[PDB]
């Protein structure tokens, strides 16, 4: 996976072929990408928004804004680095507010109780 | 502007084939820049091609 502002793409390395265009529209500058073994792709925005996508479809299933530590400037609400733990169940992020944040998936969730963002590919953007 | 200036320099001295080779390179390099396609189109239309 590779990303530039508002643009996350997936590439097959065996031949350098474009695999999928993610639904990264309006997410702004992306500072970091991480992929776990469950096909979750995480994109950390410079605007401080955590974007979670399904790697195979490129579907953005969750958007979650980080909260900067007390006394921080609005510009400090920015994700700078990330990595999943070895099991892929914990996401570690380093931010401009000088803190490290640990994220984990909700175990009470299910396909029906937490559907996430709807699959609704925007035809207006010609990235298909 | 550099591409356009180069193409114009080529056309002003009537080197139409150098200009063609250059316009083909321009659209092959930056196919999403409409200005380059319109330049090639207007050049060939001026020559009744």
């Amino acid at each position: 996976a590779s990303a530039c502002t508002d643009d996350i793409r997936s590439w097959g390395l065996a031949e350098g072929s474009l695999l999928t265009n993610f639904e990264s529209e309006k997410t702004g500058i992306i500072n970091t990408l991480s992929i776990n073994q469950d096909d979750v792709l995480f994109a950390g925005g410079d605007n401080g928004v955590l974007s979670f996508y399904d790697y195979k479809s490129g579907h953005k299933y969750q958007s979650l804004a980080t909260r900067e530590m007390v006394g921080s400037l609005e510009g400090e609400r920015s994700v700078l680095c990330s990595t999943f733990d070895k099991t892929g169940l914990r996401l570690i992020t380093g931010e401009a507010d000088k803190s490290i944040k640990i994220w984990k998936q909700d175990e009470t969730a299910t396909k029906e109780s937490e559907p996430g963002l709807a699959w609704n590919p925007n035809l207006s953007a010609k990235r298909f | 502007p550099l591409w356009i200036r180069y193409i114009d320099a080529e056309l002003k001295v009537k080197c139409i084939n150098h200009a063609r080779n250059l316009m083909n390179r321009a659209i092959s390099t930056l196919p999403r820049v409409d200005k380059l396609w319109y330049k090639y189109l207007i050049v060939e239309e001026s020559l009744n091609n």
């Binding site: 474009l18 479809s57 490129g58 | 092959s28 196919p31």
Partner: peptide, 25 residues
């Protein structure tokens, strides 16, 4: 003829996995 912008092909822009998410890599 096919001499114009020979190196530019529509398929280079199309994401191969959109037609089949489960494509094997």
């Amino acid at each position: 003829t096919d001499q114009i912008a020979k190196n530019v092909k529509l398929d280079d822009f199309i994401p191969k996995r959109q037609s089949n998410f489960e494509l094997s890599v």
